[PDB]
């Protein structure tokens, strides 16, 4: 299917890091953060089993949602069913 074909972002990409593995991936994005964090991040200090949130941004979502799905980088959304 497509991603951004008359749709918005309408999602709350929350994150749930388990350990350093998960961090090590999300951490990269920071360099070119298409996203911004909400409560509480400061990426440099993210550590295991932690829970932080992002926001409903759109248009460039595809890369973010992809960066979060292809690997299932423990992201949580409360707008599914």
Swiss-Prot record:
It comes from Sus scrofa. It comes from the Eukaryota. This is Carboxypeptidase B. Belongs to the peptidase M14 family. The gene is CPB1. It is found in: Secreted; Zymogen granule lumen. Residues 1-81 form a propeptide.
